[PDB]
Design a protein around this ligand. Structure first.
Ligand SMILES: Cc1cc2nc3c(=O)[nH]c(=O)nc-3n(C[C@H](O)[C@H](O)[C@H](O)COP(=O)(O)O)c2cc1C
Ligand SMILES: Cc1cc2nc3c(=O)[nH]c(=O)nc-3n(C[C@H](O)[C@H](O)[C@H](O)COP(=O)(O)O)c2cc1C
Lengths: 108, 110
């Protein structure tokens, strides 16, 4: 099941400011465990570092980006996340949020 | 029902050259088959292409994983368009990496 978070890139290090109900269910984390943190806590031992750097660069480009990256639930179970990030702008054109949608595509 | 611009590259050859190009690629980008075959697809890039998007692709390829990025590209005639570029690895029946496929999708004219 699919889920989504918003980060605030005007704060240092893109803390999560919104997390959909399904994110808590699918990952096992509580609201208090997620809000205010950077979403990289979903990565783990087998997460490919080149995909991590690819996400970092896509954010610096402020552009829509999708990548298949291995993530982990609170219980340690692993899943391929088809992660879809997109920028969200205010009416004046300023970057306001990143939205990032987690899509489990297979188990690991 | 839209046309499907796509290229396949050979990562067993230096710099991931194009080894196949769909008919729609030639129509959409303005390049001829002879201008394209055997070259890396970065020739679609130009002056206002974002370098971080370029590096995100380079990393996505190193990760050997499906990924997609919106990146500004240029046709042969110099017109600029945002390309929603969808790249995936292609495996042989034994599961070994064989090709990369990269589909071009104009989503905005500059
Ligand atoms: C809105 C948003 C959602 C994100 N979701 C995930 C995610 O679900 N899984 C993941 O591995 N990384 C996710 N990231 C990426 C990390 O937060 C971070 O940008 C990435 O690890 C690269 O930065 P780093 O090298 O400093 O870790 C997300 C980023 C943003 C902005
Ligand atoms: C199969 C395939 C298709 C590609 N299609 C494009 C494209 O349509 N437009 C683009 O700007 N880059 C495209 N690329 C990316 C570039 O070829 C190159 O990988 C990227 O610029 C990062 O490499 P670099 O830093 O060495 O240039 C494609 C790559 C592959 C493997």
């Amino acid at each position: 099941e699919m889920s989504v978070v918003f980060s605030d890139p005007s704060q240092p290090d893109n803390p999560i400011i919104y997390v959909s109900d399904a994110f808590l269910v699918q990952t096992g984390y509580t609201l208090e465990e997620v809000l205010g943190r950077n979403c990289r806590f979903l990565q783990g031992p087998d997460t490919n570092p080149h995909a991590v750097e690819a996400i970092r660069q896509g954010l610096k480009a402020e552009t829509r980006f999708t990548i298949d990256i291995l993530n982990y639930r609170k219980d340690g179970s692993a899943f391929v996340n088809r992660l879809r990030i997109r920028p969200i702008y205010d009416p004046e054109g300023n970057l306001m949020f990143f939205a990032g949608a987690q899509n489990p595509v297979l188990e690991h």
